[PDB]
């Protein structure tokens, strides 16, 4: 009674490689596969499936590709290892300290010539050697430093991921899905929505919002070794700036080899900072607490404390805006105890140019100076929190892997392998 | 009516007796600027290999060119002791695939031999 | 010759189909282009074979189907089509209907297979 059928609607969980796609230079010229102007989404009637955002290989692929693309983007660029010399250094010109005015003897287009050049630097990229004082660039003892090409943008233009033939992606429509287990309402797509390849630490600056309620997801909650990812159901408006009209100059250091140096500052010298709506922020923390209590007790007191110590990438909120790297002191955002029964918060931010973009050793990128004045506007869509671990449950903001900023969009998607061949008994025989 | 087309996986949640009508929908979608593009070439090649393995088996079993083929191989019961009135009407293909997954290789081996015997007999007749 | 039948009328050309069919698939940097070309030739080949399979025309260069011609696609007499036109001209003549004809072929084959199963089950 055996009958063989082909085109059977079954699948198995499988790990495959997804490809990127784009809707009409980093990211910007990464045309990938052009997207479908009007993609089809197929609801699966009667179909449920289990998802697990903490074990999602799609997250691993975004990491793999994002990191690879940034390394590839520096391949043709001018190296700054020729700048690893001793610098003589003093203050800039200010009354009463982040900036330094340092000078050195640099190479020129000819091997027989040298030039005296100088530029402005941020303290965080410069270290004293002679414990004017003598300094070296802080990363020259351990890593290569490569200048990013000044013509290349890293704007996080959203890209889509798509399954290859033989594969399809299942997507959740469950507004309350907590990242794991059965997902009662699903559909199948070939491609995910576009996701901005944003890098951040403590705050999630430009993702999607929860449909109804703030969603709190964690691999465990109970286990304090795990992170808690909080997805807001409304954005928080944040305005950041580097309020200094800076100029830039190029230096010829070799045959077609140019270095971009900070020139001077027009006007006042001011600290970089971010403005977070105070009223909105207080409301969002209250919403977070109401939802956090579901795991801690209805009348359990929840406290928001500041970050733990360590490198700026884990103690501050960092981001890339205008090409500059900001390290914002978010302690001003986490100062509250929530007990059962217009204005703004200004966070100072530090600026760095030599960046270990993926927290790796040996590959440092130098961010060339950005001219003019920088203004950044973003939608905070979520937080990365950890438990500070008996009547009060304290949470602190903190950093984590870049993977955690991507699973935040990818938790709704799973990829499976289509297996169209199979058999069943019937009443027929040849 | 209801414009029922369902879609690529379509009614994956429907029972087998309803689902095996969209076999062609799936079949038609199985084949669908500088460097490092090897990732896509690898994906293309693997899709081809999967397609060919399925086609070869349909060939070996004598079911080539069909989405549905009857064979002359008996159901041996131990594989599934469910009634056809239960299998086709109250089960989906996904549930079914799991239900008999441990016999995949048994059925496939039996199918190959049956076809081997059938071709042998046809040649004896054509040689008559 | 592979395209020797290209200027022939349809009624003359559809005898050389094997001549064309049999020639369809036939250390460093750039080897990727060569590999890509081979892969793409395979994909093209497989799509055609899959459709012939789907329509019930597998293994044939010429197959009759049980689908009627619906006239609006072309109102030319068969004698005009086969004797006074080439395949290239014809391909242009009914270009826009490709998806209609194929949709009908696909539906028909499914109905035929369904009926075969009902008879084998009887």
């Amino acid at each position, epitope marked *: 009674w055996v009958t063989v059928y082909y085109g059977v609607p079954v699948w198995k969980d499988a790990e495959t490689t997804l490809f990127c796609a784009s809707d009409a230079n980093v990211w910007a010229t990464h045309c990938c596969v052009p997207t479908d102007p009007n993609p089809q989404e*197929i609801h699966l009637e009667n179909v449920t499936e289990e998802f697990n955002m903490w074990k999602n290989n799609m997250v691993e692929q975004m990491h793999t590709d994002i990191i690879s693309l940034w390394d590839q983007s520096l391949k043709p660029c001018v190296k700054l290892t020729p700048l690893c010399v001793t610098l003589q250094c003093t203050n800039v010109t200010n009354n009463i300290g982040e900036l330094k005015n340092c000078s050195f003897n640099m190479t020129t287009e000819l091997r027989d010539k040298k030039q005296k050049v100088y530029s402005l630097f941020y303290r965080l990229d410069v270290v004293q050697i002679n414990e004017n004082k003598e300094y070296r660039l802080i990363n020259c003892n351990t890593s290569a430093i490569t200048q990013a090409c000044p013509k290349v943008s890293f704007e996080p233009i959203p890209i889509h991921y798509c399954a290859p033939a033989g594969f399809a992606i299942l997507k959740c429509k469950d507004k309350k899905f907590n990242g794991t287990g059965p997902c009662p309402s699903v559909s199948t797509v070939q491609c995910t929505h576009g996701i901005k390849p944003v890098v951040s630490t403590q705050l999630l600056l430009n993702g999607s919002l929860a449909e109804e309620e703030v969603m709190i997801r964690s691999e465990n909650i109970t286990n304090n070794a795990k992170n808690i990812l909080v997805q807001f159901n409304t954005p928080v408006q944040i305005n950041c700036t580097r309020p200094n009209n800076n100029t830039r100059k190029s230096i010829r250091i070799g045959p077609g080899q140019w270095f971009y140096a900070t020139g001077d500052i027009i006007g006042d010298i001011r600290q970089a900072h971010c403005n977070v709506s105070k009223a909105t922020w207080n409301e969002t923390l209250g919403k977070v607490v109401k939802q956090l209590r579901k795991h801690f007790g209805n009348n359990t007191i929840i406290r928001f404390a500041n970050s733990s110590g360590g490198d700026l990438e884990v103690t501050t909120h960092s981001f890339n805006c205008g090409g500059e790297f900001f390290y914002c002191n978010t302690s001003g955002l986490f100062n509250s105890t929530w007990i059962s029964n217009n204005d703004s918060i200004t966070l100072p931010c530090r600026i760095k140019q030599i960046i270990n973009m993926w927290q790796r050793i040996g590959q440092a990128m130098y961010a060339p100076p950005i001219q003019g004045v920088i203004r950044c506007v973003s939608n905070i869509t979520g937080l990365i929190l950890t438990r500070d671990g008996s009547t009060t449950e304290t949470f602190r903001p903190g950093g984590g892997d870049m993977r955690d900023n991507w699973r935040s969009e990818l938790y709704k998607y799973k990829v499976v392998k289509i297996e169209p061949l199979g058999v069943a008994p019937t009443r027929c025989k040849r | 009516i*209801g414009a029922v087309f369902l879609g690529f996986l379509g009614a994956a949640g429907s029972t087998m007796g309803a689902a095996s009508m969209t076999l062609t929908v799936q079949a038609r979608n199985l084949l669908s600027l500088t460097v490092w593009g090897i990732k896509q070439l690898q994906a293309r090649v693997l899709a081809v290999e999967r397609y060919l393995r399925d086609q070869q088996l349909l060939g070996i079993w004598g079911c080539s060119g069909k989405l549905i083929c009857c064979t002359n191989v008996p159901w041996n019961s131990s594989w599934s002791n469910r009634n056809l009135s239960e299998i086709w009407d109250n089960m989906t293909w996904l549930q079914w695939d799991k239900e008999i997954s441990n016999y995949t290789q048994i059925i496939y081996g039996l199918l190959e031999e049956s076809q081997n015997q059938q071709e042998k007999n046809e040649q004896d007749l054509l040689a008559l | 010759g592979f395209l020797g039948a290209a200027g022939s009328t349809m009624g003359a050309a559809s005898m050389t189909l094997t001549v064309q069919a049999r020639n369809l698939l036939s250390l460093t940097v750039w080897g990727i282009k060569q590999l890509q070309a081979r892969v793409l030739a395979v994909e093209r080949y497989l799509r055609d074979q899959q459709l012939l399979g789907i329509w019930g025309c597998s293994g044939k260069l010429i197959c009759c189907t049980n689908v009627p011609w619906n006239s609006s696609w072309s109102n030319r007499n068969l004698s005009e089509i086969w004797d006074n036109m080439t395949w290239l001209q014809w391909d242009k003549e009914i270009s826009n209907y490709t998806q209609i004809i194929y949709g009908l072929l*696909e539906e028909s084959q*499914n109905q035929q297979e369904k009926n075969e199963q009902d008879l084998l089950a009887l």
Partner: antibody
Amino acid sequence: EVQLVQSEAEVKRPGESLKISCQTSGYNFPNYWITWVRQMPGKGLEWMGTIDPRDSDTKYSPSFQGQVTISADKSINTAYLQWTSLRASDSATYYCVMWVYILTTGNIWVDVWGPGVLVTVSS
Amino acid sequence: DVVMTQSPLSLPITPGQPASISCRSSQSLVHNNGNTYLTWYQQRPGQPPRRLIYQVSNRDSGVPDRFIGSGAGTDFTLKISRVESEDVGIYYCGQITDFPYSFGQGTKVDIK
């Protein structure tokens, strides 16, 4: 090409029953759907209902759900709409619309309307 | 149910000039099979309606290039690149759903 042929216009007094019909011709297709619509003078269309003649399965519009019925008649390439009785409110132009559907596609390749047949109610 | 309105419902058009008609739904016209089903019809006085556009933007057979469809969700429209006297009549946005099937209000196009 595909055409629908409709029956003659007719006038009834209220309380009298009526059969109206359409015929299909000029093509040879497998699955197709038939639906009826009504056009009231000065108005757009009201959906009356639809049937798949292959299976003889009809959903109908909520309006007229219990007032008018339809037949099937695939075997003779026709379609029917039957009123149990007519009311003054039923004076309108009636249409058959045929939707040619491919079972493997999900698309309606042919959307053909007859010209419209009046059914009127008088005294 | 899909309740469909149109706007404007009265559209005199300077002859030879472009114009468009809005189509607005009570709910999404996206089907579970993933396709959006919405069609446009042209009913000239004295005629049955003709389908112009299939599945929101697919110009149908023999349909002038003058007719462009677009939209998504609940927001749809018909654009006419230039309006001819030949285009005078009532345009309808037809609704294909999970039943009941319905038609929108209808927009009259005239010349002025």
